[PDB]
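User: quick one - fold this with protoporphyrin IX containing FE bound?
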Amino acid sequence: GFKQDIATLRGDLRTYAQDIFLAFLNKYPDEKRNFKNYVGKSDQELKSMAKFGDHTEKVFNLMMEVADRATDCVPLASDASTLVQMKQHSGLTTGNFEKLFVALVEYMRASGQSFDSQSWDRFGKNLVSALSSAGMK
Amino acid sequence: GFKQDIATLRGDLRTYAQDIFLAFLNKYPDEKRNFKNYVGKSDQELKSMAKFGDHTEKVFNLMMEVADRATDCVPLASDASTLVQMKQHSGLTTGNFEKLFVALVEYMRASGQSFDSQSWDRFGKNLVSALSSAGMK
Ligand code: HEM
Ligand code: HEM
Ligand SMILES: COc1cc(Br)ccc1O
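Assistant: Sure. C-alpha cells for the protein plus protoporphyrin IX containing FE:
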C-alpha cells in the first residue's frame, strides 16, 4: 500500500524522482513556463543539468516526508502551510501540483511494480485540497 | 517536449518510421501514387520487405536531422531547400507534406507515448511555410 510505496520510492529515490518529474514535464509541456531553463532539452540532457537534478531531488525528499506524515493519505495541515509559504513557489497554483500527481499516478500504473496508485491519486487530491485551505491560489 | 520526442523517435527509428509512414499511406490512400512500388500490399507485407525498412529509416533519419536543427520548431531555410531540390521530390507540393504531418500528429496522439503533439503540429506547419519560401508550389 501507500506506506510500502514510500519505502519503494525511497529505495531508488534519485531515479524515481527523475522519472516522475520528467513524466510530468512531458505530459504537460507548457509547465516549462515555470522552468524556462528546461526548454530545448531532452530527458537525458535535463538529467545532466544541476538545477534540474537538485530541484527534483528536493521535491521528492520532501514529498516522501509529507506522504510519510500523512494519515490515510491526508497530509498534515502544517505540511500544506509550509509548501504555501515557500518563497520559491510564489508563482504556483494548486493546478501545478494537481498535474504533478496525475503524471505520478499514470507513471505508477504503467510501471508494472505493485504501487497502490489509487492511494497516490487520493494523496494528490488531498494535498491539493490542503494547499487550498492553507492559502494557495 | 520536442527535443525529447526526437530522442524517443531516434531510439527506435525504423519502427517509428514504418508505423508513421503506414499511418500516412492509410489515412491518404491517393498519396500512394507517389509510391508505385508499395501498392497492393498490407502493412505487414510492406514491413516484411527490407527495401521498405531501408527507405523509411533513411527518410525518418533526415526528418529527425531537420527537426533537431530547427529552432523552436522552425526548420532552417537551408533544410527546407534541400527537401525542395531533392530529385525524389520533384513534382511534390506543400500539400503532400501537410498531409504527412497531419498523419504523424494523429499517430502521436493515438500512441501510449507522451509526445508533444502540439510541437509536431507546429513543426509541420512551419516546415510547409519554409518549403513554400524555398520554392515548392
Ligand atoms: C511537493 C512538491 C514540491 C516541493 C517539495 C518543492 C520544493 C522546492 C524547493 C525546496 C525549492 C528550493 C530550490 C531548491 O531546493 O532547488 C523549490 C524551487 C522551485 N520550485 Fe519547487 N517544489 C515542489 C513542486 C513544484 C512544482 C509542482 C513546480 C512547478 C510546476 C515547482 C517549481 C519550482 C521552481 C520554478 C523553483 C525555483 C527553482 C529554480 O529557479 O531553479 N515546484 N521547490
Ligand atoms: C520532412 C519530410 C521528408 C523527408 C525528410 C524526406 C526525405 C526523403 C529521403 C531521405 C528520401 C530518400 C529515401 C531513400 O533513400 O529511399 C526520400 C525519397 C522520397 N520521398 Fe521524401 N521526404 C519527406 C517528405 C516526403 C513527402 C511528404 C513525400 C510525398 C508525399 C515524399 C516523397 C518521396 C518519394 C516519392 C521518394 C522516392 C521514393 C523512391 O525512391 O521510390 N517525401 N525522401
Ligand atoms: C511521406 O514520405 C515518407 C515518410 C516517412 Br515517415 C517514411 C517514408 C516516406 O516515404
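One thing worth noting: The pocket of protoporphyrin IX containing FE (ligand 2) is lined by residues B 31, 34-35, 37, 55, 58-59, 62-63, 66, 83, 88-89, 92, 96-97, 100 (CB under 6 Å).
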